[PDB]
Target: L-lactate dehydrogenase
Amino acid sequence: MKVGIVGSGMVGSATAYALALLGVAREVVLVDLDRKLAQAHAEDILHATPFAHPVWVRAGSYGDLEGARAVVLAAGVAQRPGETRLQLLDRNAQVFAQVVPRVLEAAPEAVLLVATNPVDVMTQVAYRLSALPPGRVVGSGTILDTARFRALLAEHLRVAPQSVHAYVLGEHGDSEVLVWSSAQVGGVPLLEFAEARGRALSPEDRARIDEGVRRAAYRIIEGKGATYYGIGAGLARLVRAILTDEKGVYTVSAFTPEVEGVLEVSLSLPRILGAGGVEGTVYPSLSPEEREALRRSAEILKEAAFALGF
Amino acid sequence: MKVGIVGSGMVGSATAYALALLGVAREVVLVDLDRKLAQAHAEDILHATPFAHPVWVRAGSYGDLEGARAVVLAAGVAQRPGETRLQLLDRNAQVFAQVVPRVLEAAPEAVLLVATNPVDVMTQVAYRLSALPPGRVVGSGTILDTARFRALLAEHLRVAPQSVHAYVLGEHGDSEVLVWSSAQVGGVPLLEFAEARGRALSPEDRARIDEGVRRAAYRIIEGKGATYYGIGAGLARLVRAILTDEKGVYTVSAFTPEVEGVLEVSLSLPRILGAGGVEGTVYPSLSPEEREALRRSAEILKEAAFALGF
Amino acid sequence: MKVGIVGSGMVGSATAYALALLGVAREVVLVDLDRKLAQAHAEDILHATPFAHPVWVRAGSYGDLEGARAVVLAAGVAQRPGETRLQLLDRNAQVFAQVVPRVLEAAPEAVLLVATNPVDVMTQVAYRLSALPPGRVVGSGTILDTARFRALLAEHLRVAPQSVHAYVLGEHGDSEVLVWSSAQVGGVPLLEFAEARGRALSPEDRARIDEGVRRAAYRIIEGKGATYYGIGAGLARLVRAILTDEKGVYTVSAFTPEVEGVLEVSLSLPRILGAGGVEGTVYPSLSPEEREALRRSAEILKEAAFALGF
Amino acid sequence: MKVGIVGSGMVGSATAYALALLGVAREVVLVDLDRKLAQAHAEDILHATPFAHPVWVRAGSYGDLEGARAVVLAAGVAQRPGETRLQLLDRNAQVFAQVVPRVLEAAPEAVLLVATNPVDVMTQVAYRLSALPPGRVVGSGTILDTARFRALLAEHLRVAPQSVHAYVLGEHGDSEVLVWSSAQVGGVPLLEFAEARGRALSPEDRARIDEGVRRAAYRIIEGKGATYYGIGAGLARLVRAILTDEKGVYTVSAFTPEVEGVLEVSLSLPRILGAGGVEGTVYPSLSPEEREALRRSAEILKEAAFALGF
Model:
C-alpha cells in the first residue's frame, strides 16, 4: 500500500520516519513545493530502512500519489514577520485551496489526514474543499492529548495504559476537555477504581495531570521551538488504522453535523476509524461541566471556521 | 530473563513454542520427569528459533530453573482406564505436591502460572502448597474464553477487538459466566453501541456467541483429542505481562478471600498482573443473574477444593 | 493474503500455528480428509490469535484454497508395520496424485511448498504432477539443518549466527552434505576466522557439530515420536519469503536440470526464493569429498524417482 | 536496561526517537547543557510512545546515566554562522573533554558509542580521553554507507539485501572505500554472480552506485541542512547489538593499532560488536587499488587526529 505526505517539514518528515521505523506501509511519498527538501528527507529516511523495515520512501509530485489509500496534510507556510494568527490562518487556508484539489486529482479515493494547526479549523477547511463525504476527512485532533492523559493516569494508578479508558475531546488546544466523569479502568469508573486501589485522585492530583496534558505543547515549543516527534507517531498510528481497516476508536477531528446544539463544526470525539475514514461516533456520558465546556468550545470553533469562510 | 515450564506435554511444549516464536524471554527451560520427552520437544523448538528470535530453549532439572521470574506449571498425569475424575484430581494434586516445593527451592522469587486442568482447583492447590502470598500463584483461568467473547462481539459489531470490553468470569468450564450486562464498547453500553451501529444483538445472536465461547473446548477435543495451541499462546502472553511488569488486566484465576459470600476460593476475576503476580482485583458491575451464577460457581469450586483437602 | 495447508496433522497444524504467531499471512486455510481434525486444529489456533496477531485460521475444502499464493503440502500416510520403503513411497505418491491437481484447480497461481517426507522425492513427485515451471514447486529440504549448522558454528566461534555463512546441501537426511570447505564468517574462510579468534575448529569439534546437525531428527523422534515444531517455523519463513517476494537465499529442494552430472533430480541447493518460487541457484564451491557425497546422493534420489516413475 | 544519549540536538533526539519506536530499551536518558532542549525533546518523544512501545524517555544529568550499558555521544555545538572546519572540530574536541569523564564517572561500565562528525576523529578523541580498552569506544562509522551499498547492489541484482555481503571501509567521508572485489552474494563473488544472473554491473552502474553511496550526505545537507534520520536508526541498531551482546559484524570505527601501515588510527573496519564493545576485527580481502585507497584514507584520518592532538 502507499501513503502520501504533503508538506515535508518537521511534522511531515517525522511522520514519514515513524511510518518507516514501524513498517506501516510499503511505499511513502513526500510532496513539497521545495523539491530538494522532500528529496533530502526521503533520502535521509531511506538510509534508516535497512535498520528497521523494507519501506520505499521517496519524494514526488502530486501525480505520484496515485493509488494512495491515505494522504497526510502537513502543509503550511512559515509565519512571516509582522503577521497575525488570522493573517497566517488565511495563508494556510489558501495553501489548502491548492493542495486539496491537487491531491484528489491524483488520488480521488484516498482518506485525507489533516495535521496542520489549528487542526480543527483546517480539518473543516479540507472538508469543504474536498467535496467528499464527511468521514473521508480526518484531523489528528486530540489523539496525543488523549494518549498522554491515559499515560499519566496509568502512572498514578499503577496500571497498564492499555487498561485506562479516558478521553480528551473537543478543540485541540487550551480549551480541550478532559473527560474525568466517564473515564474507566477495566470497565469500572475511574475515580471509583483509584480510591479503591488506595490511589485516590485528589483535586491536586487532577490539576497536576491536567497541566501535564494541556501544557505539553507549550513546554515543548519553549524548549525546542516546535513539536513533531509525538504527532509523527500518532499520525503513523492513524495511517495504520486506515490501511488495515482497523475500525478502532480514536479521538480525532471530523466534520460533525451537530454537537451539543452547535451545527456543522469540526472537533474531536471518539470515532471508529477504518479504510474509508471515520465511520461512526461513540459519544460518551458527560458531566454538566464537561458538556458545557464542550458546547462553548464547539460554538467558538463554528464561528472561527465561518469567519474564515468555511 | 529466564522462564521455566514444568510438564513437557502438549500444553507445556506449545507454551515453550509460543514463548520462542514471540520472543518473550531469552531462555526457556522445560522440566519433566520424562527427560527424553522434554529433550525432544526442546530440541525440536530450538530448531525453530533461527526463523524467529534468539531464544535458548532447553530441557533441564528443577536446579536449572534458578533465576526464573516465572514458572509455568503444566504438570500432571494421563487419566488411566477405570479412573474417575476425582481419582485423577488426587493424582495431579500429588504431582503438584512434589513439583511446587522443588520449583520454589530453585527460583524463590518466581511467580507460579498454573495451567493444569481443572485450573481453578489446581491453582488453589498450588497456592496452599506454595506458602506464598496469594498474588504469587496465578492460574490461566478464563483468559481464552474472555478473548473469544470479545472477538465474537467485535466481529458482530465490525469494530476493533481492542475497543470491546467484555469478561468471562468464575470457573473455567461449564459454569463460567459471560458478563453481558456491563460489557462495553468504546466506553458505552454494549447493546446501546450495537443499536447506534446498526448491528443490534438479537436473542439468537447472543445464543450463538455463547455457544461459540462455551463449547469451543468441547469441539476441539472431539476433533483432535486435546487442546493446547490456544492456551500455549495465552500463557505466553501472561508470562510477558509478568516479565515486563505490565500491570495489565486479565481474567485469571487466583486465591480470593471472598467472592459473593463464598470464602477462600480460587476462580477468575479481572486482575492486575505484574512482576509479583496479581496485585489487584477489578470487580465489574454484575446483574442479579450474573451474581447468582458467579456465587454458585464459587460455591462449587469451594466445595471441590475443600473435599480435595485444600 | 491467503496461505493454504493440505494435511492437518502435527506438521501442518504446527505450520499454521507458526504462521499465526508470526503474523505471516492474514488468512490460513487447513485442508484435510479428516474434516473434524482440521476444524479442531483451526479453532484451537484461532483461540491463540488474540494474543499475537490478527490471523484468520480456518478449516476448508480444496475450493477454499482459491487465490492462495502459497500452499504447503504436508499430506501423507503413516507407515504400516512390515511395509517396505518403496511401498510407503508409493502410497504417499498416490496421495500427491490426488492432492496436487485438486490444489492447482482452485489455485492455479499457487507456489507449492512440499513438506512431506522424504521431502526431496516428494518434491520431484509434486513437480512432475504439477505441469508447472520448475521453480513453482519447492521443498523445505535442508533449511533446518543449514540453520542448525550455522547456529553450532556461531556458538563455537562466539559470533552472531547471521554472520556465519554455511550450508547443508543435497538429500535431507543422514546423507545430507555439510559444506565445510567454503563456509565463511564475515566474508572470511571459516577455518582462518576460527584461528584468528582463538577458537580453532578441531577434528573433534567438527565431528560433534556434524552429529548435532545430522542426528537431530533421530533424537527428537526417539523422544517425541515425531518432529514438527522446527519445520513449522521453517515453512512459515519460506511462506513469508514467497508472500513478500523477498528473493532471499535458502537451501531448499527443487527440480534441477543437472547436479554434478546427475540429470533431472530434486534436492537442496542455495536458491533465490520469491513470489514465483525459486528463481535462481547460487552454486557454492565444493571440495572433492563434498561433491562426491552430493553426486552419490543425487544418484540415489534419481533412482528412487525412477522406481516411482518420476 | 538503560541507554544514555549526551547531546540532544537532531542526531541525539532522532536516536532517542528511533530507540523508542523500535523498543530497543526500557529507559532512554537525554543529557544536554541546554536543559530545556533535552526536556523538550524527551517530552515530545514521550508523546509518541503510546503509539509504539512502552519506553521511558526522559531528560537528565550525567548522574541519571547511572548503570547505562551504552551511552551515545552526539555532543558538540551548532557551528556558528561563520566558523570553519578545524575550529568547530576543536570546539567539539573540548566538549568531549568535558563529556567523557562526566559520563564514565556515572556509568563506568558503559560502552561509548560516538556519533559526532567527523565520527572517526571524534572516536579517537573519546578513546584517548576515556583511558578505557580500545574496544569500549565505538563510532557509528560507515554503517549507513555499507547498508546503502548493499541496498543498491541488491536492487540491481534483484536479490534480498540480507543476501548481499558488501562493505564500505575507512573514513566515513570523501575517502571511504567501497569494497567491490570481495563483495559476495549467497557467499559467492558478487561481480561474477551479477554477470551470471544477467545483471552485470557496467562501468555506468558502478559509477551510479558509487555516487549514490558517497554523495548521499552532500545531497541531504544541501536539501535539509543536516542529516539525522538515517544515523538515528543506525545508532539504534548498534545500541541493540550492545545491549543484547549480539556479537554481530558491523563496519564501525574503533582505535586500530595498525592498518595498511598506518599506526594508531580510528576508522571503520568489519568488527564484532557485543556487550563490551568491539571484540574482534574481520579484515576482508582487498584488491591492490582498494588496499591503496584504504591506506590513503587511514593517512588522512591520522593527519586529522594529529592536528587535534590525539
